Design a protein around this ligand. Structure first.
Ligand SMILES: CCCCCCCC/C=C\CCCCCCCC(=O)OC[C@H](O)CO
Ligand SMILES: CCCCCCCC/C=C\CCCCCCCC(=O)OC[C@H](O)CO
Ligand SMILES: CCCCCCCCCCCCCCC
Ligand SMILES: CCCCCCCCCCCCCCC
Ligand SMILES: CCCCCCCCCCCCCCC
Ligand SMILES: CCCCCCCCCCCCCCC
Ligand SMILES: [Ca+2]
Ligand SMILES: [Ca+2]
Length: 294
Protein backbone atom coordinates (compact mmCIF):
# COMPACT_ATOMS: atom_id res chain seq x y z
CA UNK A 1 0.00 0.00 0.00
CA UNK A 2 0.82 3.76 -0.05
CA UNK A 3 4.12 3.14 -1.93
CA UNK A 4 2.96 0.49 -4.37
CA UNK A 5 0.27 3.06 -5.09
CA UNK A 6 2.65 5.71 -6.43
CA UNK A 7 4.41 2.92 -8.31
CA UNK A 8 1.24 1.51 -9.86
CA UNK A 9 -0.23 4.98 -10.50
CA UNK A 10 2.58 6.44 -12.66
CA UNK A 11 3.69 3.13 -14.21
CA UNK A 12 0.14 2.81 -15.46
CA UNK A 13 0.56 6.34 -16.79
CA UNK A 14 3.78 5.37 -18.57
CA UNK A 15 1.97 2.46 -20.21
CA UNK A 16 -0.97 4.71 -21.12
CA UNK A 17 1.32 7.28 -22.73
CA UNK A 18 3.48 4.95 -24.83
CA UNK A 19 0.77 2.33 -25.27
CA UNK A 20 -1.63 4.84 -26.81
CA UNK A 21 0.96 5.95 -29.36
CA UNK A 22 1.77 2.35 -30.29
CA UNK A 23 -1.92 1.47 -30.54
CA UNK A 24 -2.54 4.52 -32.72
CA UNK A 25 0.49 3.96 -34.97
CA UNK A 26 -0.35 0.27 -35.21
CA UNK A 27 -3.93 1.01 -36.24
CA UNK A 28 -2.86 3.58 -38.83
CA UNK A 29 -0.62 0.99 -40.50
CA UNK A 30 -3.33 -1.68 -40.42
CA UNK A 31 -5.81 0.77 -41.96
CA UNK A 32 -3.38 1.36 -44.83
CA UNK A 33 -2.91 -2.40 -45.15
CA UNK A 34 -6.60 -3.29 -45.47
CA UNK A 35 -7.18 -0.17 -47.58
CA UNK A 36 -9.62 1.55 -45.21
CA UNK A 37 -9.93 5.07 -43.80
CA UNK A 38 -8.54 6.01 -40.39
CA UNK A 39 -12.13 6.70 -39.35
CA UNK A 40 -13.11 3.09 -40.03
CA UNK A 41 -10.25 1.53 -38.07
CA UNK A 42 -11.04 3.92 -35.23
CA UNK A 43 -14.76 3.17 -35.36
CA UNK A 44 -14.15 -0.57 -35.12
CA UNK A 45 -10.92 -2.18 -33.89
CA UNK A 46 -9.81 0.77 -31.77
CA UNK A 47 -13.30 1.59 -30.49
CA UNK A 48 -14.05 -1.97 -29.40
CA UNK A 49 -10.59 -2.50 -27.91
CA UNK A 50 -10.98 0.66 -25.85
CA UNK A 51 -14.61 -0.05 -24.91
CA UNK A 52 -13.72 -3.44 -23.40
CA UNK A 53 -13.52 -1.77 -19.95
CA UNK A 54 -17.14 -0.53 -20.14
CA UNK A 55 -18.41 -3.89 -21.40
CA UNK A 56 -16.81 -5.90 -18.60
CA UNK A 57 -17.81 -3.30 -16.01
CA UNK A 58 -21.46 -3.13 -17.10
CA UNK A 59 -21.74 -6.92 -17.25
CA UNK A 60 -20.20 -7.31 -13.80
CA UNK A 61 -22.25 -4.51 -12.22
CA UNK A 62 -25.56 -5.71 -13.66
CA UNK A 63 -24.83 -9.31 -12.68
CA UNK A 64 -23.77 -8.19 -9.19
CA UNK A 65 -27.20 -6.53 -9.19
CA UNK A 66 -26.21 -2.89 -9.38
CA UNK A 67 -27.72 -2.02 -12.79
CA UNK A 68 -27.53 1.67 -11.91
CA UNK A 69 -23.76 1.46 -12.25
CA UNK A 70 -24.08 -0.44 -15.53
CA UNK A 71 -26.10 2.17 -17.42
CA UNK A 72 -24.50 5.00 -15.45
CA UNK A 73 -21.02 4.01 -16.61
CA UNK A 74 -22.22 3.45 -20.18
CA UNK A 75 -23.90 6.83 -20.67
CA UNK A 76 -21.24 8.59 -18.61
CA UNK A 77 -18.70 7.21 -21.06
CA UNK A 78 -20.57 8.50 -24.11
CA UNK A 79 -20.85 12.00 -22.64
CA UNK A 80 -17.15 11.88 -21.75
CA UNK A 81 -16.09 10.83 -25.25
CA UNK A 82 -17.89 13.73 -26.93
CA UNK A 83 -17.35 16.43 -24.32
CA UNK A 84 -13.90 15.71 -22.91
CA UNK A 85 -12.16 13.39 -25.38
CA UNK A 86 -13.41 14.87 -28.66
CA UNK A 87 -13.29 18.33 -27.08
CA UNK A 88 -9.56 18.19 -26.37
CA UNK A 89 -8.72 16.54 -29.70
CA UNK A 90 -10.63 19.04 -31.86
CA UNK A 91 -8.62 21.86 -30.30
CA UNK A 92 -5.34 20.01 -30.84
CA UNK A 93 -6.15 19.03 -34.43
CA UNK A 94 -9.23 20.64 -36.07
CA UNK A 95 -11.26 18.36 -38.36
CA UNK A 96 -13.10 19.11 -41.59
CA UNK A 97 -15.47 16.17 -42.02
CA UNK A 98 -15.84 14.77 -45.55
CA UNK A 99 -19.27 14.13 -47.08
CA UNK A 100 -18.83 10.40 -46.50
CA UNK A 101 -18.14 10.47 -42.75
CA UNK A 102 -21.07 12.86 -42.24
CA UNK A 103 -23.29 9.98 -43.29
CA UNK A 104 -21.76 7.74 -40.62
CA UNK A 105 -22.24 10.46 -38.01
CA UNK A 106 -25.91 10.96 -38.92
CA UNK A 107 -26.43 7.20 -38.59
CA UNK A 108 -24.79 7.42 -35.17
CA UNK A 109 -27.26 10.17 -34.26
CA UNK A 110 -30.28 8.06 -35.23
CA UNK A 111 -28.91 5.11 -33.26
CA UNK A 112 -28.56 7.29 -30.16
CA UNK A 113 -32.00 8.88 -30.50
CA UNK A 114 -33.44 5.39 -30.90
CA UNK A 115 -31.69 4.20 -27.74
CA UNK A 116 -32.99 7.19 -25.78
CA UNK A 117 -36.60 6.56 -26.81
CA UNK A 118 -36.66 2.86 -25.93
CA UNK A 119 -34.86 3.65 -22.68
CA UNK A 120 -37.47 6.00 -21.23
CA UNK A 121 -39.05 3.10 -19.33
CA UNK A 122 -35.61 1.61 -18.74
CA UNK A 123 -33.71 -1.00 -20.73
CA UNK A 124 -35.17 -4.51 -20.85
CA UNK A 125 -33.08 -7.47 -21.96
CA UNK A 126 -35.00 -7.22 -25.23
CA UNK A 127 -33.91 -3.59 -25.60
CA UNK A 128 -30.34 -4.82 -25.24
CA UNK A 129 -30.76 -7.50 -27.90
CA UNK A 130 -32.01 -4.85 -30.32
CA UNK A 131 -29.15 -2.42 -29.65
CA UNK A 132 -26.58 -5.22 -29.91
CA UNK A 133 -27.76 -6.15 -33.41
CA UNK A 134 -27.71 -2.54 -34.64
CA UNK A 135 -24.19 -2.45 -33.19
CA UNK A 136 -23.21 -5.36 -35.45
CA UNK A 137 -24.98 -3.86 -38.47
CA UNK A 138 -23.24 -0.51 -37.91
CA UNK A 139 -19.84 -2.19 -37.76
CA UNK A 140 -20.42 -3.95 -41.07
CA UNK A 141 -21.98 -1.02 -42.85
CA UNK A 142 -19.08 1.16 -41.68
CA UNK A 143 -16.38 -1.25 -42.87
CA UNK A 144 -17.93 -1.89 -46.31
CA UNK A 145 -18.22 1.73 -47.50
CA UNK A 146 -14.69 2.28 -46.23
CA UNK A 147 -13.21 -0.82 -47.85
CA UNK A 148 -11.55 -1.44 -51.23
CA UNK A 149 2.29 -14.40 -47.09
CA UNK A 150 4.40 -13.35 -44.10
CA UNK A 151 4.70 -9.60 -44.72
CA UNK A 152 7.00 -8.11 -42.02
CA UNK A 153 5.26 -4.74 -42.44
CA UNK A 154 1.90 -6.22 -41.47
CA UNK A 155 3.29 -8.27 -38.58
CA UNK A 156 4.99 -5.20 -37.11
CA UNK A 157 1.66 -3.39 -37.39
CA UNK A 158 -0.27 -6.11 -35.54
CA UNK A 159 2.33 -6.26 -32.77
CA UNK A 160 2.22 -2.48 -32.23
CA UNK A 161 -1.58 -2.58 -32.17
CA UNK A 162 -1.90 -5.49 -29.74
CA UNK A 163 0.96 -4.48 -27.43
CA UNK A 164 -0.40 -0.94 -27.58
CA UNK A 165 -3.90 -2.05 -26.62
CA UNK A 166 -2.50 -4.21 -23.83
CA UNK A 167 -0.46 -1.17 -22.82
CA UNK A 168 -3.47 1.12 -22.46
CA UNK A 169 -5.80 -1.47 -20.90
CA UNK A 170 -3.24 -2.64 -18.34
CA UNK A 171 -2.08 0.95 -17.90
CA UNK A 172 -5.65 2.02 -17.19
CA UNK A 173 -5.88 -0.73 -14.58
CA UNK A 174 -2.63 0.16 -12.81
CA UNK A 175 -3.77 3.78 -12.77
CA UNK A 176 -7.11 2.67 -11.34
CA UNK A 177 -5.66 0.11 -8.91
CA UNK A 178 -2.92 2.54 -7.90
CA UNK A 179 -5.16 5.50 -7.09
CA UNK A 180 -7.57 3.27 -5.15
CA UNK A 181 -4.72 1.87 -3.06
CA UNK A 182 -3.41 5.36 -2.30
CA UNK A 183 -6.77 6.63 -1.04
CA UNK A 184 -7.27 3.70 1.35
CA UNK A 185 -3.69 3.97 2.61
CA UNK A 186 -4.48 7.62 3.32
CA UNK A 187 -7.96 6.90 4.73
CA UNK A 188 -9.52 9.49 2.39
CA UNK A 189 -11.63 6.80 0.72
CA UNK A 190 -15.27 7.30 -0.26
CA UNK A 191 -17.17 4.99 -2.63
CA UNK A 192 -18.36 7.46 -5.21
CA UNK A 193 -14.93 8.72 -4.92
CA UNK A 194 -15.45 5.04 -5.51
CA UNK A 195 -17.31 4.61 -8.84
CA UNK A 196 -15.82 7.93 -9.82
CA UNK A 197 -12.47 6.25 -10.74
CA UNK A 198 -13.57 3.50 -13.11
CA UNK A 199 -16.26 5.63 -14.72
CA UNK A 200 -13.23 7.69 -15.71
CA UNK A 201 -11.01 4.61 -15.69
CA UNK A 202 -12.94 3.06 -18.56
CA UNK A 203 -12.58 6.31 -20.53
CA UNK A 204 -8.81 6.52 -20.08
CA UNK A 205 -8.10 4.26 -23.09
CA UNK A 206 -10.22 6.45 -25.39
CA UNK A 207 -8.73 9.63 -23.92
CA UNK A 208 -5.03 8.81 -24.28
CA UNK A 209 -5.46 7.11 -27.66
CA UNK A 210 -7.47 9.98 -29.14
CA UNK A 211 -4.97 12.46 -27.69
CA UNK A 212 -2.16 10.46 -29.28
CA UNK A 213 -3.86 10.41 -32.68
CA UNK A 214 -4.64 14.13 -32.34
CA UNK A 215 -0.92 14.83 -31.89
CA UNK A 216 -0.32 13.10 -35.23
CA UNK A 217 -3.14 15.02 -36.95
CA UNK A 218 -5.38 11.96 -37.25
CA UNK A 219 -8.77 13.67 -36.98
CA UNK A 220 -10.56 10.84 -38.75
CA UNK A 221 -9.15 8.20 -36.41
CA UNK A 222 -10.09 10.30 -33.38
CA UNK A 223 -13.60 11.01 -34.67
CA UNK A 224 -14.04 7.35 -35.58
CA UNK A 225 -12.83 6.27 -32.15
CA UNK A 226 -15.32 8.62 -30.49
CA UNK A 227 -18.29 7.55 -32.62
CA UNK A 228 -17.41 3.87 -32.38
CA UNK A 229 -16.81 3.82 -28.62
CA UNK A 230 -20.16 5.48 -27.91
CA UNK A 231 -21.96 2.91 -30.06
CA UNK A 232 -19.86 0.20 -28.41
CA UNK A 233 -21.03 1.59 -25.07
CA UNK A 234 -24.74 1.64 -25.89
CA UNK A 235 -25.01 -1.35 -28.23
CA UNK A 236 -22.26 -3.19 -26.39
CA UNK A 237 -21.77 -2.24 -22.75
CA UNK A 238 -25.32 -1.09 -22.00
CA UNK A 239 -26.81 -4.02 -23.93
CA UNK A 240 -24.96 -6.76 -22.02
CA UNK A 241 -26.04 -5.12 -18.77
CA UNK A 242 -29.70 -5.44 -19.71
CA UNK A 243 -29.19 -9.16 -20.38
CA UNK A 244 -28.54 -9.84 -16.69
CA UNK A 245 -31.03 -7.33 -15.30
CA UNK A 246 -33.37 -4.48 -16.24
CA UNK A 247 -31.51 -1.17 -16.37
CA UNK A 248 -33.09 1.86 -14.64
CA UNK A 249 -34.06 4.80 -16.85
CA UNK A 250 -31.49 7.59 -17.10
CA UNK A 251 -33.57 10.09 -19.07
CA UNK A 252 -31.65 13.21 -17.99
CA UNK A 253 -28.26 12.00 -19.21
CA UNK A 254 -29.75 10.53 -22.39
CA UNK A 255 -31.17 13.96 -23.22
CA UNK A 256 -27.70 15.37 -22.58
CA UNK A 257 -26.13 12.71 -24.80
CA UNK A 258 -28.72 13.34 -27.53
CA UNK A 259 -27.97 17.07 -27.39
CA UNK A 260 -24.20 16.55 -27.58
CA UNK A 261 -24.68 14.03 -30.39
CA UNK A 262 -26.96 16.43 -32.27
CA UNK A 263 -24.35 19.19 -31.96
CA UNK A 264 -21.63 16.82 -33.17
CA UNK A 265 -23.65 16.11 -36.31
CA UNK A 266 -24.48 19.75 -37.02
CA UNK A 267 -20.84 20.82 -36.70
CA UNK A 268 -19.72 18.00 -38.98
CA UNK A 269 -22.17 18.84 -41.76
CA UNK A 270 -22.28 22.64 -42.01
CA UNK A 271 -19.12 23.70 -40.16
CA UNK A 272 -15.95 22.11 -38.80
CA UNK A 273 -14.74 20.45 -35.61
CA UNK A 274 -11.95 22.71 -34.42
CA UNK A 275 -10.94 25.15 -31.70
CA UNK A 276 -14.23 26.83 -30.79
CA UNK A 277 -16.33 23.70 -31.32
CA UNK A 278 -13.99 21.79 -29.02
CA UNK A 279 -14.17 24.57 -26.44
CA UNK A 280 -17.96 24.22 -26.38
CA UNK A 281 -17.78 20.45 -25.82
CA UNK A 282 -15.40 20.91 -22.89
CA UNK A 283 -17.62 23.59 -21.36
CA UNK A 284 -20.70 21.38 -21.70
CA UNK A 285 -18.75 18.51 -20.12
CA UNK A 286 -17.63 20.73 -17.25
CA UNK A 287 -21.24 21.85 -16.75
CA UNK A 288 -22.30 18.20 -16.96
CA UNK A 289 -19.86 17.09 -14.27
CA UNK A 290 -20.97 20.15 -12.28
CA UNK A 291 -24.73 19.56 -12.52
CA UNK A 292 -25.41 15.87 -13.29
CA UNK A 293 -25.47 12.72 -11.12
CA UNK A 294 -25.56 8.93 -11.44
C1 LIG B 1 -36.72 6.88 -34.38
C2 LIG B 1 -37.39 6.53 -33.05
C3 LIG B 1 -37.89 5.08 -33.08
C4 LIG B 1 -38.56 4.78 -31.74
C5 LIG B 1 -39.08 3.35 -31.67
C6 LIG B 1 -39.72 3.17 -30.29
C7 LIG B 1 -40.27 1.76 -30.10
C8 LIG B 1 -40.87 1.69 -28.69
O1 LIG B 1 -41.67 2.55 -28.31
O2 LIG B 1 -40.45 0.65 -27.92
C9 LIG B 1 -41.08 0.73 -26.64
C10 LIG B 1 -40.48 -0.31 -25.70
O3 LIG B 1 -41.11 -0.22 -24.42
C11 LIG B 1 -38.98 -0.04 -25.54
O4 LIG B 1 -38.41 -1.01 -24.65
C1 LIG C 1 -36.48 15.36 -19.28
C2 LIG C 1 -35.91 14.95 -17.92
C3 LIG C 1 -36.45 13.56 -17.58
C4 LIG C 1 -35.93 13.02 -16.23
C5 LIG C 1 -36.47 11.60 -15.89
C6 LIG C 1 -37.98 11.36 -15.61
C7 LIG C 1 -38.95 11.83 -16.70
C8 LIG C 1 -40.40 11.48 -16.39
C9 LIG C 1 -40.58 9.96 -16.44
C10 LIG C 1 -41.61 9.57 -17.51
C11 LIG C 1 -42.17 10.80 -18.24
C12 LIG C 1 -41.75 10.94 -19.71
C13 LIG C 1 -40.22 10.97 -19.86
C14 LIG C 1 -39.88 11.17 -21.33
C15 LIG C 1 -38.37 11.10 -21.57
C16 LIG C 1 -38.19 11.32 -23.07
C17 LIG C 1 -36.75 11.13 -23.57
C18 LIG C 1 -35.60 12.00 -23.03
O1 LIG C 1 -35.75 12.71 -22.04
O2 LIG C 1 -34.41 11.91 -23.73
C19 LIG C 1 -34.18 12.38 -25.10
C20 LIG C 1 -35.14 11.90 -26.22
O3 LIG C 1 -35.19 10.47 -26.27
C21 LIG C 1 -34.72 12.46 -27.58
O4 LIG C 1 -35.63 11.99 -28.58
C1 LIG D 1 -27.38 0.92 -37.54
C2 LIG D 1 -28.26 2.15 -37.79
C3 LIG D 1 -29.46 2.13 -36.84
C4 LIG D 1 -30.33 3.36 -37.10
C5 LIG D 1 -31.53 3.34 -36.16
C6 LIG D 1 -32.34 2.06 -36.41
C7 LIG D 1 -33.55 2.03 -35.47
C8 LIG D 1 -34.43 3.25 -35.74
C1 LIG E 1 -24.64 -12.88 -28.33
C2 LIG E 1 -25.20 -12.63 -26.93
C3 LIG E 1 -26.67 -13.06 -26.86
C4 LIG E 1 -27.16 -12.80 -25.44
C5 LIG E 1 -28.62 -13.21 -25.25
C6 LIG E 1 -28.99 -12.92 -23.80
C7 LIG E 1 -30.44 -13.32 -23.49
C8 LIG E 1 -30.71 -13.01 -22.02
C9 LIG E 1 -32.14 -13.42 -21.65
C10 LIG E 1 -32.40 -13.12 -20.17
C11 LIG E 1 -33.82 -13.55 -19.82
C12 LIG E 1 -34.13 -13.27 -18.34
C13 LIG E 1 -35.55 -13.73 -18.04
C14 LIG E 1 -36.55 -12.97 -18.92
C15 LIG E 1 -37.97 -13.44 -18.61
C1 LIG F 1 -24.72 25.82 -22.76
C2 LIG F 1 -26.25 25.80 -22.72
C3 LIG F 1 -26.72 25.74 -21.26
C4 LIG F 1 -26.18 24.47 -20.60
C5 LIG F 1 -26.64 24.42 -19.14
C6 LIG F 1 -26.11 25.65 -18.40
C7 LIG F 1 -26.57 25.61 -16.94
C8 LIG F 1 -26.03 26.84 -16.22
C9 LIG F 1 -24.50 26.86 -16.28
C1 LIG G 1 -28.61 19.24 -15.30
C2 LIG G 1 -30.02 19.18 -14.71
C3 LIG G 1 -30.27 17.80 -14.11
C4 LIG G 1 -29.26 17.53 -13.01
C5 LIG G 1 -29.30 16.19 -12.24
C6 LIG G 1 -30.43 15.65 -11.30
C7 LIG G 1 -31.94 15.26 -11.49
C8 LIG G 1 -33.12 16.16 -11.92
C9 LIG G 1 -33.12 16.75 -13.32
C10 LIG G 1 -34.37 17.60 -13.53
C11 LIG G 1 -34.36 18.19 -14.94
CA1 LIG H 1 -13.63 2.73 -22.82
CA1 LIG I 1 -37.49 0.17 -22.35
Amino acid sequence: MVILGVGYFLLGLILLYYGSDWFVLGSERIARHFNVSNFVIGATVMAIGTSLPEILTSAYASYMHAPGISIGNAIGSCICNIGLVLGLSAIISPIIVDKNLQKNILVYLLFVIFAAVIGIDGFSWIDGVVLLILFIIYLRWTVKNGSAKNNPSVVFSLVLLIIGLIGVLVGAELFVDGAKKIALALDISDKVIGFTLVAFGTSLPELMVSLAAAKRNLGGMVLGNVIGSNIADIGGALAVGSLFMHLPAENVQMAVLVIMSLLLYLFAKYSKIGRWQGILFLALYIIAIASLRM
